Design a protein around this ligand. Structure first.
Ligand SMILES: COc1ccc(-c2csc(C(=O)NOCCCCCC(=O)NO)n2)cc1
Ligand SMILES: [Zn+2]
Ligand SMILES: [Zn+2]
Ligand SMILES: [Zn+2]
Ligand SMILES: [Zn+2]
Length: 352
């Protein structure tokens, strides 16, 4: 099989003890997996085992202080879990949370190793909790450890430190944690598309504006594509890929592509309120397959409509497997955003 897939039910264990209906649901991953079964995709994929990230692997991106706190949650009584959760922006913690975050990251290391040692060409990682808001020193926005960031460092640690890794983050929210981790790094290109609303959208920071292009040797290696006003869908995202994502990615000529693949920009998503279709995410995946000789790992981030995320992610796996892609003027604010990013990134990317 040319595509690997990682899925472990143990990552369902993480749960919100006080709100069993919180939208970051255990069945996010089971619903995705079972849709893979329905669409006859599981039989085509090589099953990659999950495993725990080690603490030394976590230290690739996270402080020992942060690591320490999250690990301590394993032995906390309910009252302390509740207090600890409450110290961060939108986090719940149960006693299984730590183990699940380890699994999510280790699952992605195994997937990256599977791709880099030629076991598979590409892979999809059906994991939770998500990763991309987690910073070096703190959890945030349902995220404990930065799964995609760790995977990029892990990939470098088992090849060469200078391995060029692209992270495309198509979650509807900005990956503050990913940007910050790699903000002064030219070895990891970070590209994020995200609803912004001039700062009114989570995570509610100007860090996500198109003018944050990176720092030091990192200048040009942080691309933020912010949406302001309007339910963006397939047209805006395709246009963003044509004018920005792909021209820049091609020039960077990455050796591994990581997708921070939230499906919360999908039609039906209560959190995102956008309109990207499964076929849309299919075309995005197919386009990214033209980079790094096909060496793409798709990592689940957010996405809260169980039907939308299951149909979307399954469609991405279908494209990785090499199926044909399945079959509208832009909103104005989208043209505007694309044009602003083009201007901010012209200094760095001659493709633009
Ligand atoms: C009926 O319409 C609805 C509107 C909102 C919600 C809801 C549930 S919680 C939350 C929210 O926005 N919390 O703020 C934290 C965000 C972190 C995101 C995690 C991620 O996807 N990282 O990219 N919003 C539910 C229904
Ligand atoms: Zn990310
Ligand atoms: Zn994003
Ligand atoms: Zn960077
Ligand atoms: Zn999200």
């Amino acid at each position: 099989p040319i595509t690997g897939l990682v899925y472990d039910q143990r990552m369902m264990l993480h749960h919100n003890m006080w709100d069993s209906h919180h939208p970051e649901l255990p069945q996010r991953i089971s619903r995705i997996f079972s849709r893979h079964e329905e669409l006859r995709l599981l039989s085509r994929c090589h099953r990659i085992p999950a495993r725990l990230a080690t603490e030394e692997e976590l230290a690739l991106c996270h402080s020992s202080k942060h690591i320490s706190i999250i690990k301590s949650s394993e032995h906390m009584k309910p009252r302390d879990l509740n207090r600890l959760g409450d110290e961060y922006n939108s986090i719940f913690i149960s006693n299984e949370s730590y183990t699940c975050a380890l699994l999510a990251a280790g699952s992605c290391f195994n997937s990256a190793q599977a791709i880099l040692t030629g076991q598979v060409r590409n892979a999809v990682a059906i994991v939770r909790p998500p990763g991309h808001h987690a910073e070096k020193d703190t959890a945030c926005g349902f995220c404990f450890f930065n799964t995609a960031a760790l995977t990029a460092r892990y990939a470098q640690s088992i090849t060469r430190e200078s391995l060029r890794v692209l992270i495309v983050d198509w979650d509807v929210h900005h990956g503050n944690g990913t940007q910050h981790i790699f903000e002064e790094d030219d070895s990891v290109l970070y590209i994020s598309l995200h609803r912004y609303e001039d700062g009114a959208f989570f995570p509610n920071s100007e860090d996500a504006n198109y003018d944050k292009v990176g720092l030091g040797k990192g200048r040009g290696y942080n691309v933020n594509i912010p949406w302001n006003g309007g339910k963006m869908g397939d047209p805006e995202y395709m246009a963003a890929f044509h004018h920005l994502v792909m021209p820049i990615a091609r020039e960077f000529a990455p050796e591994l592509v990581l997708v921070s693949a939230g499906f919360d920009a999908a039609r039906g998503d209560p959190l995102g309120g956008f309109q990207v279709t499964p076929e849309g995410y299919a075309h995005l995946t197919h386009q990214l397959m033209s980079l790094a000789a096909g060496r793409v790992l798709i990592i689940l981030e957010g996405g809260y409509n169980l039907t939308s995320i299951s149909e979307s992610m399954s469609m991405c796996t279908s494209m990785l497997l090499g199926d044909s892609p399945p079959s509208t003027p832009l909103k104005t604010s989208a043209t505007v955003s694309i044009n602003n990013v083009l201007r901010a990134h012209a200094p760095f990317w001659s493709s633009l």
